[PDB]
Design a protein around this nucleic acid. Sequence first.
DNA 1: GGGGGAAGGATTCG
DNA 2: ACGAATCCTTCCCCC
Length: 341
Amino acid sequence: MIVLFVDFDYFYAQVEEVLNPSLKGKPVVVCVFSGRFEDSGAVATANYEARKFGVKAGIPIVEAKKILPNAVYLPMRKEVYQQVSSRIMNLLREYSEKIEIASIDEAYLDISDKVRDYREAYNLGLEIKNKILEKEKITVTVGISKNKVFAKIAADMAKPNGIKVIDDEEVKRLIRELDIADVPGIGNITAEKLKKLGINKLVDTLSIEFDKLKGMIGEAKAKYLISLARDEYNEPIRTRVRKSIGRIVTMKRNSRNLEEIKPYLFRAIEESYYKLDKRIPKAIHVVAVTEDLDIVSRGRTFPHGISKETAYSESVKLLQKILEEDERKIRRIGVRFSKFI
DNA sequence: GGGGGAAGGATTCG
DNA sequence: ACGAATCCTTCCCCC
């Protein structure tokens, strides 16, 4: 089987560059301004010109400006990025029926029934890159390997504007020398748990007792790592369907006053409904991020679809249940809809 | 003991 | 180190 992974480099910032090409070569920083005070918020994405100096996703905007005071800071325009992304995904469908749209800037293509050997794959890759650069002016990195995981790892190693193949031989080596923390799907939390279990490389997962490994990171993640270690991971490329939709908004000031929170809650509901479009949810959850950044949620599932009027009234009951089951002030408030009919 | 689901905290990622 | 969506464990009903 042969998988080709496509990752759009520093996507949000690149799109801003395509929409205002005079930004090329300058440090571009796309941010989420939370509006709690001047420059409150964080960097969502930055191009290479800014990343090389340490300005990257997650760094507070204020901190970023101390490092690059003259870089260009832009607000996130998510809908534009999504429309651009969709056009690019369509260009990719021309290369394979079985395509998995992993995120706004990632997609996997199963080009087995389309190419033989890793020479034709590399060529199909260049073909895809040039195509995208031509039609949308966007640069992408391509990763090629036997499964989705190593296809992703190859791209991570070739970014930006790169292409890389990880053959069956490099795979076996990586299973020995790659930091377990560099394996997709393994975040910060899991990484630390594995180390304390004595696992720093994939190969090490085979030296531990499965019911011990499973006890720490869970059955699903355990089998995931074991499969990868034995060079047996072969999940099929298939695009999943959105299981839920929601919106969470940061309030100007923290508080626990119902009448002060409702406006934000309603704003979030209105936006979530617009996004739902023609989907009718049967489940609603209200989510509150407290002052100490801890998240509390309460939801309800109905035997039928939820109208917007039902959403408004139900969301207040859930928020009240939340304010009741926790004395902490709230900082962000929002909702999520799911179980679409 | 275990199947069918609802519920909410846990975890991943930009 | 400051938004979105799914994952994972627990609990409840009931055969």
